[PDB]
Amino acid sequence: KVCYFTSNGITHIDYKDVDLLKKFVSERGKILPRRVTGTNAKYQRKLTAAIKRARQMALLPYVSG
Amino acid sequence: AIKKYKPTSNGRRGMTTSDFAEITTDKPEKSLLAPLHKKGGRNNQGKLTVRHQGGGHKRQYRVIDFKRDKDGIPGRVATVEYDPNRSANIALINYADGEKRYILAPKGIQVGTEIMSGPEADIKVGNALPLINIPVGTVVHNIELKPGKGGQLVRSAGTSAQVLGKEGKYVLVRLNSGEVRMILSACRASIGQVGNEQHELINIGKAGRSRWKGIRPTVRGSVMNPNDHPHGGGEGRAPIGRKSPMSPWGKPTLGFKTRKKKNKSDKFIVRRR
Amino acid sequence: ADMLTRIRNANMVRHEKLEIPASKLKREIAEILKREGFIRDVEFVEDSKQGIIRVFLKYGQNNERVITGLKRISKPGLRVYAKSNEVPRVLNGLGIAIISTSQGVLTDKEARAKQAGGEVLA
Amino acid sequence: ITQERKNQLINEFKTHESDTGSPEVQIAILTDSINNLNEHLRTHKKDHHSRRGLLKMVGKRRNLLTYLRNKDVTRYRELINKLGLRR
Amino acid sequence: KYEVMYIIRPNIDEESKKAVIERFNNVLTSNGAEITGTKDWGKRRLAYEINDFRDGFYQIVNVQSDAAAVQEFDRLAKISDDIIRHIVVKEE
RNA sequence: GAACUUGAGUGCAGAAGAGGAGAGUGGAAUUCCACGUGUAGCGGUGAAAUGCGUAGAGAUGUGGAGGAACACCAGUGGCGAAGGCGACUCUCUGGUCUGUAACUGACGCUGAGGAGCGAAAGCGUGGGGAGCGAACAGGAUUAGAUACCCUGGUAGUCCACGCCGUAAACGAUGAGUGCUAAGUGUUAGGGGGUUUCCGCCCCUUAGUGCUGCAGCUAACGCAUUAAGCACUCCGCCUGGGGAGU
Ligand SMILES: [K+]
Ligand SMILES: [K+]
Ligand SMILES: [K+]
Ligand SMILES: [Mg+2]
Ligand SMILES: [Mg+2]
Ligand SMILES: [Mg+2]
Ligand SMILES: [Mg+2]
Ligand SMILES: [Mg+2]
Ligand SMILES: [Mg+2]
Ligand SMILES: [Mg+2]
Ligand SMILES: [Mg+2]
Ligand SMILES: [Mg+2]
Ligand SMILES: [Mg+2]
Ligand SMILES: [Mg+2]
Ligand SMILES: [Mg+2]
Ligand SMILES: [Mg+2]
């Protein structure tokens, strides 16, 4: 596996960048593990924050199917 | 805050008092005072119609503005004052045009604060708006029931009501009691909890202090004689010795509900307390 | 300021050499030890610290030391001051005690002669 | 951030022009942080974790003040008067 | 440095849309803020309904205030019937 | 008394973090209430019964009220002196790590008493009370069953302020410092390779794990995060009961 954020050289994850965050959630809406996505620990923290901010303002869903 | 006195005598043991920290002056506004004689619980026939009322300290009435009807004119809080006629403190407002009025002092309010009434006022503690203009979840006090009549509900020290919802002509309001009730959306309310919230914690301490506040002794029914009370008589002490505890006038007095059946306001009471 | 443990630990694992922070008395101990046949030479360098040079004690030049099983003990912060008369001998000879004097060290004869017992080692 | 407090109590007893580690400067910065943190704790009475921070600063400052007093008796007296400490 | 995103209710004319946005910009600027950037994401489908609004107009603002401004934004944004969601995030 | 910079601090530049305090906010689920549809069960157990249901339950749909806890992320992962800390946002605020060495020049370590913090339960005053649930009741079970199981259910669990000061408060391992084979994960950094980066590789600091030398151990085991080799200071032990009386 390889980290999307380390490989592409992304050092900051916007909550508003929806299309990026859709790569790291399930069909149902649940945040995908590091085992599946292969992302780094530091980015997985930054990502998770971004997901949770997105869900607050209805950019991403809590639960959906 | 509550000041606890030291037990320097049996009278003083347990007694507590307000520190009166919020009070900023000792002298009321002379132009807003009116005379107020005691009545002893006696009606226009001269007869005692309410028990246990009598004596106490002489008091002057402070004319409170319960209507809050100087719309759009800003007013500055000049004082917070003791009022002997009610549990809450009152605030002298200096209006920009030179009119002075007293209002109930909300929790928080400071000398110098600007207050404002009317439909285009901010949701700040001390402002007063028609209930149609007050957001859901706002804590309010001094609620009108009839447009223009003045605030009647939620005036005592520390009391508060919350606006729950809007049904066009009516707004739902949770009252202090916990009763949820419909109030006309044109009825005003004042923003915030009423102040002097520690009032209920006061330990009156001695018999005499009750007498200063105009309360005369309560005699229990069970130590009266049968001609005075349903509980009267019996040799030695007696239990209630009746199907129900009774009032002095022979109604049941423990659980018996006394709100008039076929009250007109029943349609506006959503959830009872 | 305990070279002894540094020595013991390296001596246990049959180390060739060890770098001990230098001090006047730790220098003067290493030479007392060298009287047997440890240390070949050291490298005095441009002084930044006062001991960066170290002692560079090299008691294991060959694979196995001819002088092996080095052992010390008597070094407590509670001060142990020996009488010139009552200076001890480690193992009744076959071991030395670095008895710090105003002017002398080492054997029992180097006590009543030299004088101040002072420090006592083993 | 204030290098104001640095350049003040540098120059009073300056070893270097760009002295930072003078006891004067340290004690002054500690005094500024201590006093700032006290006013946090006036509001946040039950912030115990931060308050342990205060007690460490206080202990640093005391130890640096005991250091001056033993070192330079005059220099100590000048510092406590300007900061307005007692000990 | 703060980003202030907020959703406006979708039942809004473009006249009254501007009236809201211009008022909340004036809430920031009047209370000692400098609006150093704005953006309009426009009408979007919400991931979940809020206040019976399946969709809503998103609206970003960037400010370089000192707290009191963006604090005052929140209390007015909560009061207002037109702002249906809002956040304030500190910038990195 | 005079020096020094290796200890210990400061400055400067980075880094990570469920460290703490305050205010606000979000979604899911449970419960209750109202209403629509619908009709005879539901629920529960080892098996039952008490319960709840035709005064229409359960199920299903919609809305309302309220409280509490924060799926996924989540990891011998992180942070904290310990207790502990897990939705989001802002406000205030403590510490740690790395690098740089401009500055300070033993300013250090430990620390009886003292002062503070300290899970849960408990206590006081005032709130709140969905869910859970000591007590208590009923149903079972049983020789009995003041239990386990079932159905209810009060305090309490939650909040504010105050008190209490204890836990197998555990790593059953006091703190500080140095020294003494390796191998391999992982967290946050740093430097340096050929390379445009990514990436790979080497080195390195501080954590966090596993395996394992020497040494230690009554044995089990410990083993650079020592229970090894040392030094400093504190706490504690001296057969079992009686008695933490
Ligand atoms: K009394
Ligand atoms: K009585
Ligand atoms: K009687
Ligand atoms: Mg009465
Ligand atoms: Mg009688
Ligand atoms: Mg009678
Ligand atoms: Mg009778
Ligand atoms: Mg009798
Ligand atoms: Mg003791
Ligand atoms: Mg508790
Ligand atoms: Mg309690
Ligand atoms: Mg049960
Ligand atoms: Mg104990
Ligand atoms: Mg524990
Ligand atoms: Mg123990
Ligand atoms: Mg200590």
3-class SS letters over E1-55: CEEEEEEECCCCCHHHHHHHHHHHHHHHHHCCCCEEEEEEEEEEECCCCCCCCCE
Both structure tokens of B133: 């203009």
Does A contact E via 3+ CB–CB distances below 8 Å?
yes
CB contact under 8 A, A62 and E47: yes
What DSSP character marks residue D48? H
Using a CB-CB cut-off of 8 Å, the residues of chain A touching E92 are 12
DSSP structure string for B32-87:
GEEEE---TTB-TTS-B-SSSB-----EEEE-B--S---BT--EEEEEEE--TTSS
A7: CB within 7 A of chain F nucleic strand? yes
The chains in contact with chain A, meaning 3 or more Cβ pairs closer than 8 Å, are E
For B124, which residue in chain E has the nearest alpha carbon? E75
Both structure tokens of B210: 């009750």
* Residue in the block written with tokens 């004052």: B81
CB contact under 8 A, A64 and E47: yes
Both structure tokens of B157: 């020290």
For residues C109 and C85, is the Cβ–Cβ distance under 8 A?
no
Q: What share of chain D is helix, strand, coil (3-state, %, to 5)?
A: 75, 0, 25
Q: Which residues contact E29 (CB under 8 A, 6 or more apart)?
A: E35
> For residue B127, which of B190, B195, B66 has the smallest C-alpha distance?
B190
* Residue in the block written with tokens 């954020």: A5
- Give the determination technique: cryo-EM
> For residue B134, which of B63, B68, B65 has the smallest C-alpha distance?
B68
Q: Say if residue E74 is exposed, middle or buried (CB neighbours under 10 Å; 0-12, 13-18, 19+).
A: middle
CB contact under 8 A, E89 and A15: yes
**Helix (H), strand (E) at residue D32:** helix D23-43
User: What span, in angstroms and rounded, lies between the C-alpha atoms of B90 and B105?
Assistant: 5
Q: How far is CA D12 from CA C42, D17, D22, D63, in A?
A: 47, 11, 10, 20
For B134, which residue in chain E has the nearest alpha carbon? E79
What single letter denotes the amino acid at residue C9? N
> What distance in angstroms lies between residue D45's CA and the mean position of ligand 13's atoms?
29
For residues C105 and C32, is the Cβ–Cβ distance under 8 A?
yes
For B245 and F153, how far is CA from C1' in angstroms? 29
> For residue E2, which of E64, E83, E85, E72 has the smallest C-alpha distance?
E64
Strand F within 7 Å of which CB atoms in D 31-50? 33, 36-37, 40, 43-50
> What distance in angstroms lies between residue B237's CA and the mean position of ligand 7's atoms?
9
User: What span, in angstroms and rounded, lies between the C-alpha atoms of E40 and E33?
Assistant: 19
Helix C24-34 to helix C3-12 angle (10° resolution) is 40
Smallest CA–CA distance, residue E90 to chain B, in Å, is: 27
DSSP structure string for C17-74:
-B-----HHHHHHHHHHHTTS----------SSSSTT---B---SSSS-SS-------
For residues C69 and C48, is the Cβ–Cβ distance under 8 A?
no
**What's the CA angle centered on C53, arms C50 and C57, to 5 degrees?**
125
User: What span, in angstroms and rounded, lies between the C-alpha atoms of D68 and D78?
Assistant: 11
Both structure tokens of B30: 């002379």
User: What span, in angstroms and rounded, lies between the C-alpha atoms of A51 and A49?
Assistant: 5
Strand F within 7 Å of which CB atoms in A 23-62? 26, 28-34, 40-42, 44-49, 52-53, 55-56, 62
For residues B82 and B88, is the Cβ–Cβ distance under 8 A?
no
Scored b (16 or more CB within 10 A) or e, B4-32 reads: eeeeeeeeeeebeebeeebbbeeebbeeb
For residues A22 and A60, is the Cβ–Cβ distance under 8 A?
yes
